[PDB]
Amino acid sequence: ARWFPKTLPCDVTLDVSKNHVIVDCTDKHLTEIPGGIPTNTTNLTLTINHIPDISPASFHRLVHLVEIDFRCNCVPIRLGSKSNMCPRRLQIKPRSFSGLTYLKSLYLDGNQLLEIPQGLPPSLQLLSLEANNIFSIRKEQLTELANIEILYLGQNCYYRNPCYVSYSIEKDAFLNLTKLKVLSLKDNNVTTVPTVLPSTLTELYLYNNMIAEIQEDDFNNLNQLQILDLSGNCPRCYNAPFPCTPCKNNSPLQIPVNAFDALTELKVLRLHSNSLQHVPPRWFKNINNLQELDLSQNFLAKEIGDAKFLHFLPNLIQLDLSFNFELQVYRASMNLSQAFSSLKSLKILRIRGYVFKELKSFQLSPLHNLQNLEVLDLGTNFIKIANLSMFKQFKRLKVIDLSVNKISPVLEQLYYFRYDKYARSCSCYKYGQTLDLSKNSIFFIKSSDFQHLSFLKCLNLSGNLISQTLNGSEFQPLAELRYLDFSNNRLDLLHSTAFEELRKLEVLDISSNSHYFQSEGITHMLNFTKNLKVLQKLMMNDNDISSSTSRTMESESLRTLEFRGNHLDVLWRDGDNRYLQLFKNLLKLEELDISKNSLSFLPSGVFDGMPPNLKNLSLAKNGLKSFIWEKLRYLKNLETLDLSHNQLTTVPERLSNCSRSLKNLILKNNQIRSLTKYFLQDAFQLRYLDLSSNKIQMIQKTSFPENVLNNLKMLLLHHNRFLCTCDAVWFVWWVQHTEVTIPYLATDVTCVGPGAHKGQSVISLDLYTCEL
Amino acid sequence: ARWFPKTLPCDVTLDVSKNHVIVDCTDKHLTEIPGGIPTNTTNLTLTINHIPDISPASFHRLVHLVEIDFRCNCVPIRLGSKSNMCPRRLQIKPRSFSGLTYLKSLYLDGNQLLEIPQGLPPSLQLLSLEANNIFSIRKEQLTELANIEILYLGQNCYYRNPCYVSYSIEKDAFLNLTKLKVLSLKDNNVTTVPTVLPSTLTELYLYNNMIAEIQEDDFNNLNQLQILDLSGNCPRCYNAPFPCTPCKNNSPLQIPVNAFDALTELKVLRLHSNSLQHVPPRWFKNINNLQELDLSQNFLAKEIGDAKFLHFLPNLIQLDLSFNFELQVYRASMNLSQAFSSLKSLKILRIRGYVFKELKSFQLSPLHNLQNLEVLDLGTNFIKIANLSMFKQFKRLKVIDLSVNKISPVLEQLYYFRYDKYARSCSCYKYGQTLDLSKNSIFFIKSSDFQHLSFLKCLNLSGNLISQTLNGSEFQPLAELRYLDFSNNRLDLLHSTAFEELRKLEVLDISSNSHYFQSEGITHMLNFTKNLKVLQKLMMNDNDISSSTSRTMESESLRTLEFRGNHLDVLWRDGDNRYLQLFKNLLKLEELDISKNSLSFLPSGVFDGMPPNLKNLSLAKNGLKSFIWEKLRYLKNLETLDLSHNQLTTVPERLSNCSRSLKNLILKNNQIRSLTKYFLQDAFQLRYLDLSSNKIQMIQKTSFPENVLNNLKMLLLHHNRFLCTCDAVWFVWWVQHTEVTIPYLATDVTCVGPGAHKGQSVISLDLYTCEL
Ligand SMILES: *[C@@H]1O[C@H](CO)[C@@H](O[C@@H]2O[C@H](CO)[C@@H](O)[C@H](O)[C@H]2NC(C)=O)[C@H](O)[C@H]1NC(C)=O
Ligand SMILES: *[C@@H]1O[C@H](CO)[C@@H](O[C@@H]2O[C@H](CO)[C@@H](O)[C@H](O)[C@H]2NC(C)=O)[C@H](O)[C@H]1NC(C)=O
Ligand SMILES: *[C@@H]1O[C@H](CO)[C@@H](O[C@@H]2O[C@H](CO)[C@@H](O)[C@H](O)[C@H]2NC(C)=O)[C@H](O)[C@H]1NC(C)=O
Ligand SMILES: *[C@@H]1O[C@H](CO)[C@@H](O[C@@H]2O[C@H](CO)[C@@H](O)[C@H](O)[C@H]2NC(C)=O)[C@H](O)[C@H]1NC(C)=O
Ligand SMILES: CC(C)Cn1cnc2c(N)nc3ccccc3c21
Ligand SMILES: CC(C)Cn1cnc2c(N)nc3ccccc3c21
Ligand SMILES: *[C@@H]1O[C@H](CO)[C@@H](O)[C@H](O)[C@H]1NC(C)=O
Ligand SMILES: *[C@@H]1O[C@H](CO)[C@@H](O)[C@H](O)[C@H]1NC(C)=O
Ligand SMILES: *[C@@H]1O[C@H](CO)[C@@H](O)[C@H](O)[C@H]1NC(C)=O
Ligand SMILES: *[C@@H]1O[C@H](CO)[C@@H](O)[C@H](O)[C@H]1NC(C)=O
Ligand SMILES: *[C@@H]1O[C@H](CO)[C@@H](O)[C@H](O)[C@H]1NC(C)=O
Ligand SMILES: *[C@@H]1O[C@H](CO)[C@@H](O)[C@H](O)[C@H]1NC(C)=O
Ligand SMILES: *[C@@H]1O[C@H](CO)[C@@H](O)[C@H](O)[C@H]1NC(C)=O
Ligand SMILES: *[C@@H]1O[C@H](CO)[C@@H](O)[C@H](O)[C@H]1NC(C)=O
Ligand SMILES: *[C@@H]1O[C@H](CO)[C@@H](O)[C@H](O)[C@H]1NC(C)=O
Ligand SMILES: *[C@@H]1O[C@H](CO)[C@@H](O)[C@H](O)[C@H]1NC(C)=O
């Protein structure tokens, strides 16, 4: 199919429209730039390899390069692998880039460089030097960068990459970079705002440094600035998950009342973790276009009840006041200033970590007439008491977030506390109004708890303490509910009328309610589904279900059932036929996950007991030691079969004689050592085949006919035991010449032998002696 | 060291005192009896193999045999592996056993035999034929068994091994077995008690059959009988986890009032799952020595409130009345008859599954003066209300079991519901008075909850809903408490005074309290240990701990810390030195488990931060990719190092130069491919070395010096990648001739190559061609 097999260990992609030739050698275990990169290459990515040096020979023929991504070939020791440490910093020889007349972007992050590389072409718009060892910026070193527009210099001096001195920037070092728009000096041990800066700047990142004072006029000329981040200067260090040294005398970052006067275009101001005790209104007197303000992790508890500065922010969209609580103070309630009611445009208000015992509707009245409010986040406040009915006045909201509180009758998990949330590396909301009570202490629910909440579309009760026999009465007011997350509670399914009052329920998650399923004698009614007439998806994963009082689950509507992490092996004990049709009467079911059910064999009758429209079946991670492939004929609509992570040793003699319809067959991580003589013969709408991580030694053409192999969208063969003898001549030739996508050819499709060929890639194999 | 290497694939043990030669071939994948079994063999075990037949040649020379254990060489299909099903039943040719003049015990269970084997020697005392296909007993087939004392014939006709007809026993089939003492016909589809049985019987097992009625004279001559089990005849089928057919019209097994009159020696009566509604006192009129009575899984709920039969049971030790509740009835309280107070000798009372809402002190008053009572089990009763102070009247008890209830302000997991709890296969009580409240709904505790319980030595609160900041006040009355199981709650360690009122506490289990450790911003005081002055063992596994407000844990008493399943990889993030001494001030710590902490590397400072008397350290299951063995020099008292299940690839050049104290080194399941030249040179304190499940190809003599191998109690080498070429001549010869204990030589110490030798045991390898 190809006359010239591709031997380059990089992925090569073509974008005709933009005339781009994309060569991606990410994580190919290279120790040298590979030979034979196409001369027309425009984008070359060499990230995460161990190439030790760059030189004029490196990109000699690649004169059309617009981008070189050469990140992390020598990452600082504390940031990189300790098993394969980089022995010596990257070496860049003179004139390696000067011939790259079209070069627009150069990423050299994470290479332990000591200086800004010189000789850079004047076409360059973007230079990235994060996580190097450059901590002195001099003007001579920047003249080469006359046309630069984006400059990343951060993470060159901080606790994961120390330089042991203060960062140094020469007076006016950046001022003649007349096109510079984005400057990032974060995580750098910087002590003063550099001046004077070019007035073209749109974004200035100065966060996580040692700046104790802003001068008057530090930002005097930046009338185009749109984003300013001064966070983490004078940090709030309590419970910090990184080594944290506060400014002396409990001092805040000191910002003169007029410091932002010039910033008329400012849209985002981030003052997270600056130990602020007051927010002077004067700050915002000539900023009228501000949309995003981050004041989290300061000491603004007393200020939130006053907050006169809010009157100057009628265009604010997002306000974050999280984690401003006074240490060791557990306030009785939340005191929001009336000034909040002047925030016409506010869509998102986050006030986590205010820390108070009781939320009362009257406390939220300053927010009552904010017409655009979409998210109210009061998580992580240790609230013990909240009458949920108070949110009848907030029907317009999209998300009411009370996650992680102590109530009883999506941001990253580390978000407010991590060092740099933007560090670069080498859900039910869509259903409508959402009330998030997850991770609270709700141990008993009753209908009155939800009075005036009929508008709710998604209720998250995950991770409460609900240990109750639901009888269909607990959720009466929730007439519109489409999504209920009940996971990680202690559901007791004594009554099959559980949940039946949620008449519009489409998704139900009762996963990780294993508690009552773990003790003998307790009754479980798994047929509670019959009464839910629009239920589309049911998740009951990790419930340890090993017994059921009812012998059939019933639904006219269910399409998806997740049943992972249960004990169907016990339910289907050989000789007990009573539960072999447990899923048979789920007549619209198309997807069934019964992985992780300890099913070491499938009793005969399982496949005949499947519902008729089953499309996606997972039997993964079952320790399956044998499989009667012929029984798949019962599954007349089957299109995806996931048998991964089992102990299978054979494939069917004729996949065409087992499942005529099957499109995706996943057999990775089994014990298959050979294929049947005619395995894929006539399997014409097979499209995806994963045989990776098995023990296959040889494959012959009869098992792998081309009538099927090139209608394959992907064929996975890596991590097997291929024997590269003269018997493998067809397989080797086909792999070398095929158009079919086979991942990891450059890295993990390898001969195990014989001898000379051990560890050699099949792509590089020369078997001419077989043809002498 | 040996002149004649052992090639027999069986373990051979010598007991000089008992004149026994024990040959154990259990599960050796044998398809024939091996040649060369010692002529002096007295005990030969061939269980779980695939030997298809027995013949006079089988034991031809083994005339001293006293026991043959030939179980499970052809298991019934539903009971056996479905990947290696037995193709044909065991074949026994005539006179295979008649020469075995000393044979006392013959186990032929699970071989699909169709008849009682004939030709057995008259020495035979024990014959076991369970899980065969023998379902008609004729007197002629039993004549060979004149001296038999123990006869196991059950599991020959039941749902896991059907015969599709009723069991048949000829009239008086057993009567001329004049020495018969133990007869078991369980799980056999038996329809009547066989009569007449020999009066020498001491134990009669008739359980799990289809006996609907006992005749008044069925047991008339059994004046020596000590154990009678009639359970599972007319079973109680509600929630049965096995196919269960009840007697018609809800009838119980029906037992005339005088059916037990002859059984004056009876000590054990088992009537579990007989659908009994009454226990007539007349049953026990001539039974005065009964010690154990099982009446579980009947319908005796109302009888328990009357129970006149108990007046005839003054010598009873154990009484089981569990799971007698009326279906769909949730009683208000438990009604124990006053007759219970006549149970003078009772030690154990189990009344699980009575099902009632409220336990009150007065309900237990019939038990108040049972002086010998040790165990009171009221688990699995859905009790909602119980004042724990009532157990001040029960200080003499060893265990008060309220496990699995619904209280709010050790038997196998399947026990009462499994089909045959005696089916054969092919904890804090020791601290003193124990109150087991595990798996209840306790969400809040206060000191008054434990008023008058100061005598308690162990409290099990595992698996409640306790989501509370303990401050040292919640357990004040528990002045004698030595063991607290607080696992699987939601401990909030805000205060370092948590648990300090438990002044005699020696063991604390706060494992699986990960809830509050999983959300950022929450304060956790890990230094709460300082206040527990006799605390010996702390378990805090599976807490997901990744942050700590305190930097050091402190204790003058702690000897064992389990810290498995946390995130020390995050706590010890490279460049953050603040927690590197977390354990340093546990000055008496001898055992530390920090397995499963995602430690892919160990930051420098970890080993210097360890406390000085550490002896047993586990770093297992960490994904460890590298290890600086020299740092072990800091651990001057280290004796056990568990590095199993990691990704290590090398051993130290000289282990002796890394640790002078190390005795036990566990390296199993790593990626080691070779040993260093002088690995064990002069490692004189080494006693135990596990290298199994690595990728080792070759071992040379320099690595394994003889003066070290001679002190090894065990050296594990199985499941490596041994290359059996002429380069391996020393290793192969040494393995064949050494006295060092090496497990699995017969099964899993194998050549992977070259070619011809693939899969061959190295013990069987002949390398003479290397020496021509
Ligand atoms: C190839 O390199 C060019 C040059 O850097 C990339 O072009 C940039 O793409 C981003 C994506 O929106 C734009 O925001 C930048 O403005 C572009 N810069 C220039 C100078 O054009 C291009 O994305 C790269 N393509 C691939 C597939 O890697
Ligand atoms: C940031 O700069 C400070 C100096 O401003 C560095 O601190 C010095 O470190 C040296 C060597 O570690 C000490 O001898 C000095 O006493 C320190 N000076 C002060 C004022 O503390 C610090 O190491 C730098 N931070 C990083 C992460 O490199
Ligand atoms: C070897 O076989 C003999 C005879 O079967 C075993 O001796 C019996 O051991 C049980 C176990 O306690 C005793 O109750 C019996 O009284 C013993 N004698 C008989 C005739 O059964 C002996 O235990 C076996 N040894 C081993 C190591 O398996
Ligand atoms: C126990 O014995 C009964 C008969 O006493 C067996 O039941 C018969 O089974 C055959 C074959 O399935 C049926 O055609 C008969 O109608 C059954 N008779 C009755 C009275 O039910 C039963 O199969 C046996 N049980 C086992 C496990 O072998
Ligand atoms: C059928 C009842 C008489 C006993 N019972 C059996 N299963 C259950 C169960 N899951 N929850 C319960 C909760 C309260 C009371 C009884 C039960 C119960
Ligand atoms: C110290 C408080 C100002 C805030 N706080 C910080 N960590 C915690 C914590 N684990 N549990 C709590 C329980 C109730 C109230 C506050 C907290 C709390
Ligand atoms: C709320 O806090 C503000 C700010 O100090 C204060 O002026 C006001 O009195 C407080 N109101 C209440 C009800 O606590
Ligand atoms: C909660 O507030 C609602 C008002 O919407 C009221 O009807 C209800 O009684 C309140 N519940 C409690 C427990 O105060
Ligand atoms: C509910 O909350 C839990 C825990 O906070 C979260 O993991 C889960 O994804 C949420 N459920 C939905 C449906 O968004
Ligand atoms: C579920 O099945 C059981 C049969 O075991 C029956 O008692 C119960 O009424 C059924 N419930 C529904 C809703 O069908
Ligand atoms: C307990 O039940 C028995 C059985 O009928 C009855 O005779 C007795 O009066 C009951 N006692 C109490 C206190 O309920
Ligand atoms: C529990 O019983 C004790 C008597 O031993 C009594 O002092 C206490 O008040 C009772 N507690 C409750 C809540 O009834
Ligand atoms: C406490 O009870 C739990 C749950 O039944 C059990 O797993 C655990 O072993 C018990 N703890 C002790 C110390 O006996
Ligand atoms: C500890 O908590 C209990 C109940 O929350 C309270 O009665 C007691 O005063 C507290 N003790 C201290 C020292 O705070
Ligand atoms: C635990 O550590 C915290 C801060 O690290 C300290 O305030 C507290 O007093 C300590 N408690 C004990 C018992 O050492
Ligand atoms: C390790 O070996 C070297 C060379 O024999 C020796 O100098 C050194 O002291 C040894 N270290 C230990 C801890 O035994």
Tokens at B446, concatenated: 């206060």
Alpha-carbon distance B349 to B320, whole Å?
A: 6
**CA neighbor of B685 nearest in space, from B662, B718, B655, B653:** B662
Cβ partners under 8 Å of residue A536, min gap 6: A506, A507, A557, A558, A559, A560
Rounded to the nearest 5 degrees, what angle is found at the Cα of B360, between the Cα atoms of B484 and B455? 35
Tokens at B529, concatenated: 């240990």
A496 lines ligand 10 (CB under 6 A): yes
Which residues in chain B are closer than 8 Å to A625, comparing Cβ atoms? Answer: 81-83
From atom 2 of ligand 6, which residue's Cα is the shortest distance away?
Answer: A328
A 612-631 residues with CB < 8 A to B? 625-626
| Alpha carbon of B335 to ligand 11 centroid (Å) | 6
Is residue A721 a contact partner of residue A695, using CB atoms and an 8 Å limit? yes
The whole-angstrom distance between B183's CA and the closest CA on chain A is 26
A 415-434 residues with CB < 8 A to B? 415-418
A460 lines ligand 9 (CB under 6 A): yes
From atom 4 of ligand 7, which residue's Cα is the shortest distance away?
Answer: A305
From atom 13 of ligand 12, which residue's Cα is the shortest distance away?
Answer: B387
Please tell me the experimental approach by which this structure was elucidated.
Answer: X-ray
**CA neighbor of A484 nearest in space, from A528, A549, A550, A547:** A528
Q: How many C-beta neighbours within 10 Å does residue A726 have?
A: 10
Q: Quote the strand ranges of B219-311, DSSP E.
A: 227-229, 268-270, 292-294
Alpha-carbon distance B175 to B182, whole Å?
A: 13
Is residue B433 a contact partner of residue B456, using CB atoms and an 8 Å limit? yes
B377 is in an annotated binding site: no
The single-letter code of the amino acid at A440 is N
The single-letter code of the amino acid at B284 is F
* A425 DSSP 8-state letter: P
Alpha-carbon distance A212 to A222, whole Å?
A: 21
Which residues in chain A are closer than 8 Å to B521, comparing Cβ atoms? Answer: 239, 323, 352-353, 380, 416-417
Alpha-carbon distance B183 to B205, whole Å?
A: 6
Is residue A306 a contact partner of residue A281, using CB atoms and an 8 Å limit? no
Tokens at B700, concatenated: 């040379």
Alpha-carbon distance A538 to A555, whole Å?
A: 11
Tokens at A651, concatenated: 């494939």
The single-letter code of the amino acid at B540 is M
Pocket test for ligand 5, best of A495, A520, A522 (most atoms within 8 A of CB): A522
| Alpha carbon of B343 to ligand 12 centroid (Å) | 28
Tokens 């639904």, located at residue: A555
Is residue A535 a contact partner of residue A506, using CB atoms and an 8 Å limit? yes
Rounded to the nearest 5 degrees, what angle is found at the Cα of A680, between the Cα atoms of A674 and A684? 160
* A187 DSSP 8-state letter: S
Q: Is the peptide bond before B754 cis (omega within 30 degrees of 0)?
A: yes
Ligand 13 contacts (CB < 6 A) are: B 403, 427-428, 438-439, 460, 462-463, 485
Q: Is the peptide bond before B651 cis (omega within 30 degrees of 0)?
A: no
Is residue B355 a contact partner of residue B379, using CB atoms and an 8 Å limit? no
Residue B83 burial (C-beta neighbours within 10 Å; 0-12, 13-18, 19+): middle
Q: What is the largest CA-CA distance in chain B?
A: 91
A637 backbone dihedrals φ, ψ, rounded to 5°: -110, 10
Alpha-carbon distance A43 to A643, whole Å?
A: 39
Give bridge partners of residue B654 from the DSSP assignment.
none
Helix H segments across A638-728? 706-709
B335 lines ligand 16 (CB under 6 A): no
Tokens at A570, concatenated: 């016990």
Q: Is the peptide bond before A196 cis (omega within 30 degrees of 0)?
A: yes
CB contact under 8 A, B159 and A575: yes
Tokens at B583, concatenated: 């354990």
A141 lines ligand 5 (CB under 6 A): no
Is residue A156 a contact partner of residue A133, using CB atoms and an 8 Å limit? yes
Alpha-carbon distance B259 to B271, whole Å?
A: 13
B368 backbone dihedrals φ, ψ, rounded to 5°: -60, -35
Task: Give the Å distances, CA to CA, from A588 to A275, A344, A560, A610.
Answer: 58, 48, 9, 11
**CA neighbor of A437 nearest in space, from A478, A495, A492:** A478
**CA neighbor of B262 nearest in space, from B296, B292, B295, B224:** B224
Helix (H) or strand (E) holding B747: helix B745-748
Alpha-carbon distance B668 to B743, whole Å?
A: 13
Q: Supply the range of the domain harboring residue B321.
A: 1-772
Atom of ligand 16 nearest to the CA of B633: 13
* B282 DSSP 8-state letter: G
* DSSP string covering B292-357: EEE--SSS-HHHHTT-GGGGG-TT--EEE--S-PPTT--EEE----GGGGG-TT--EEE-TT--EE
Tokens 């160990």, located at residue: B602
* DSSP string covering B544-567: -----SSS--EESS--EEE--SS-
Q: Quote the strand ranges of B496-544, DSSP E.
A: 507-509, 537-539
Is residue B556 a contact partner of residue B588, using CB atoms and an 8 Å limit? yes
B523 is in an annotated binding site: yes
Which residues in chain B are closer than 8 Å to A413, comparing Cβ atoms? Answer: 518-520
Q: Does A585 contact B at CB distance below 8 Å? A: no
Which residue in chain B has the smallest CA separation from A578?
A: B243
Q: How many C-beta neighbours within 10 Å does residue B609 have?
A: 19
CB contact under 8 A, B520 and A162: no
Alpha-carbon distance B326 to B238, whole Å?
A: 11
The single-letter code of the amino acid at B606 is V
Is residue A206 a contact partner of residue A229, using CB atoms and an 8 Å limit? yes
Counting Cα atoms < 13 Å in the Cβ hemisphere of A526 gives 23
- Total of domains in chain B: 1
From atom 1 of ligand 14, which residue's Cα is the shortest distance away?
Answer: B471
Counting Cα atoms < 13 Å in the Cβ hemisphere of B369 gives 4
Is residue B448 a contact partner of residue B424, using CB atoms and an 8 Å limit? no
* B193 DSSP 8-state letter: -
A 539-558 residues with CB < 8 A to B? 546-547, 549
Alpha-carbon distance B229 to B201, whole Å?
A: 13
Alpha-carbon distance B395 to B638, whole Å?
A: 43
Which residues in chain B are closer than 8 Å to A243, comparing Cβ atoms? Answer: 575-578
Which residue in chain A has the smallest CA separation from B239?
A: A549
Tokens 């609270």, located at residue: A440
Q: Does A495 contact B at CB distance below 8 Å? A: no
CB contact under 8 A, A417 and B521: yes
Cβ partners under 8 Å of residue B635, min gap 6: B607, B610, B614, B617, B659, B661
Is residue B93 a contact partner of residue B72, using CB atoms and an 8 Å limit? no
Task: Please report, in angstroms and rounded to a whole number, the separation of the first and last CA atoms in chain B.
Answer: 24
Tokens 């040993």, located at residue: B675
Tokens 């109680």, located at residue: B236
Task: Give the Å distances, CA to CA, from B139 to A284, B129, B136, B149, B170.
Answer: 106, 16, 10, 16, 6
Task: Give the Å distances, CA to CA, from A235 to A208, A251, A253, A418, A575.
Answer: 8, 10, 8, 12, 67
* B633 DSSP 8-state letter: G
Task: Give the Å distances, CA to CA, from A692 to A669, A720, A748, B71.
Answer: 7, 6, 10, 39
Stated in angstroms to one decimal place, the resolution of this structure is 2.1
Q: What is the 3-state secondary structure (H, E, C) of B340-362?
A: HHHCCCCCEEECCCCCEEEECHH
SS3 B21: strand
* A139 DSSP 8-state letter: H
Breaks in chain A (C–N beyond 2.5 Å) sit after: 409, 426
Residue A292 burial (C-beta neighbours within 10 Å; 0-12, 13-18, 19+): middle
Give the pairing of strands A150-152 and A126-128: parallel
CB contact under 8 A, B439 and A519: yes
Residue B422 burial (C-beta neighbours within 10 Å; 0-12, 13-18, 19+): exposed
Alpha-carbon distance A135 to A137, whole Å?
A: 7
CB contact under 8 A, A82 and B601: yes
**Domain CATH for A578:** 3.80.10.10
Rounded to the nearest 5 degrees, what angle is found at the Cα of A424, between the Cα atoms of A422 and A429? 50
Tokens 């990410």, located at residue: A26
Burial code (b: 16+ CB inside 10 Å, e: under 16) for A441-465 equals bbbbbeeebbeebebbbbbbbbbbb
